[PDB]
Write a protein that binds this ligand. Sequence first.
Ligand SMILES: O=C(Nc1cncc2cnccc12)[C@@H]1CCNc2cc(Cl)c(Cl)cc21
Ligand SMILES: [Cl-]
Lengths: 302, 296
Amino acid sequence: SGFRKMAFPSGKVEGCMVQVTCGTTTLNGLWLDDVVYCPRHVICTSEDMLNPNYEDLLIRKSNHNFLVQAGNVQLRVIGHSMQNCVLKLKVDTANPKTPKYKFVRIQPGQTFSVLACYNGSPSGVYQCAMRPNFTIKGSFLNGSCGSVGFNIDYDCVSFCYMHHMELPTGVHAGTDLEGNFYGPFVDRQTAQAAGTDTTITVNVLAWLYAAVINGDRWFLNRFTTTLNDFNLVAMKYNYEPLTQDHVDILGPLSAQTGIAVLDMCASLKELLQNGMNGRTILGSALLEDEFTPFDVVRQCSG
Amino acid sequence: SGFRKMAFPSGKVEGCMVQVTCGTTTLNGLWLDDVVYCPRHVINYEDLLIRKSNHNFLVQAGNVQLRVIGHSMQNCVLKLKVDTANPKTPKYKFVRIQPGQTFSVLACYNGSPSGVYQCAMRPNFTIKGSFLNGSCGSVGFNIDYDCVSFCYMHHMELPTGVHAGTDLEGNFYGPFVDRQTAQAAGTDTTITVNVLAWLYAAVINGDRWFLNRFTTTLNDFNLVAMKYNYEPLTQDHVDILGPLSAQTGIAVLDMCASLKELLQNGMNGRTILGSALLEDEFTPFDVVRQCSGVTF
Ligand SMILES: O=C(Nc1cncc2cnccc12)[C@@H]1CCNc2cc(Cl)c(Cl)cc21
Ligand SMILES: [Cl-]
């Protein structure tokens, strides 16, 4: 019993954190085998930030310009290439602590752990979700660039995010490990604003199922709804449209608890209309949306 | 910017998780040097342990089987002496924490770490954890510079879903015993110092709606706090909140008056750090370490 926002054990990722320095800029890198991955904006200066030509800036760099630091040991850069918004620094030493890994691009609503780093040194780990607006509500300070997002399913580390920047609203933008940004964001100082955020409906429904598994049934009701009537109500509360795909994903939880997906939808509709009324669901006074249907099954069953 | 429930990097502790099996029971152990620590319920514990031999305990570190060469019991923890010293043993200490103090929990099933979360020792000596069968032996810890401070070992779940465990010396937290009997967690209280610390972290992140021009006496605040089932705020707590009071420019008894109003009046459809409730599982140190970027 119990429900907590849980992150994956960060051990496998800690062994990959290195410090990457170029000129005045110092950020983190992900050392996997003989390649160190880091945001391409490490090559950037003060004036080469609003409109940087990264191809032109990287052509002026040599391998000895990049000081890569793994613990106390200084790694020697032997090559450098750029893939979209990440810099791939080829090094002369392969990381012995390299785990089994994959580079995966996640979709909005997906959750992942974040190992926050400062100067190639891990300071904390937290669980967070890719928001529907493609930003992450992280906890980052200056120097956190190159911190990574991951899911350690079974024994493989699935890298899904590298932190690149903070938007003016305190939310964060970053890329998959191939340098492709999540959202309409670019690595330029230009005015960029996060789109209007929405609540991840499928995750809220999964979290209601985890509450039912933990014996919290106060919010359940005798009503059901059509998928279209639910979405017409959900859109008014700034909730993500629940697709038929989401309904199918919630299938196992619906079977385990004995409450149909559309029945749990009507429960949510009533929760949106009435609120909590001094009550909590899983110790929370708000409808939590950073637990996917897969997270709920993992933490409640195995 | 941003505030999250953050746990310490679990890497140093992951290297210490082993699977301990004895008869039908299978749980986790903490392998530090040549000793594996695990709950004694894996086996009248003095009488039950005298009937055991070293080969009864199957200790498993990854795929490698460790051979037990001795066994002793220290309070509610079994100390299984093994032939091999853990090469992944970090610099560590066994520390007993006080209620209100927070720590990370590396949840494990069959000596295999599955998740890490941050939680606090409740004033009632229970932890609101996330545990299933097989996690007995999962440890609680804090990182101090490069040293792992082990402060908890999970033993059981109470009928309310809350957990009961011991320090790494086998001394239970709270009035709990490791036996099949009626045990209930005491009435819980909110950790006042941690709520105040969390209000300071909200101020650091630009959330100031709850602030007011008012201050209070420590005696008047504690009168109100006692009425709302909050832990008494000592002068020690006021001193601990000192750096945050200086950083934000809001006196500790000024922030107390904001909490006083938030308790009698509520939030009124508003949130503080994305939360509609007053969060109490961030200590004043956690707020400082997170809002200052301390690394390990
Ligand atoms: O955002 C950035 N860094 C940070 C990361 N995460 C959180 C923070 C919090 N407060 C300060 C800084 C932070 C950096 C530097 C500042 N400006 C900037 C601009 C661009 Cl176009 C890009 Cl790609 C990166 C940055
Ligand atoms: Cl995904």
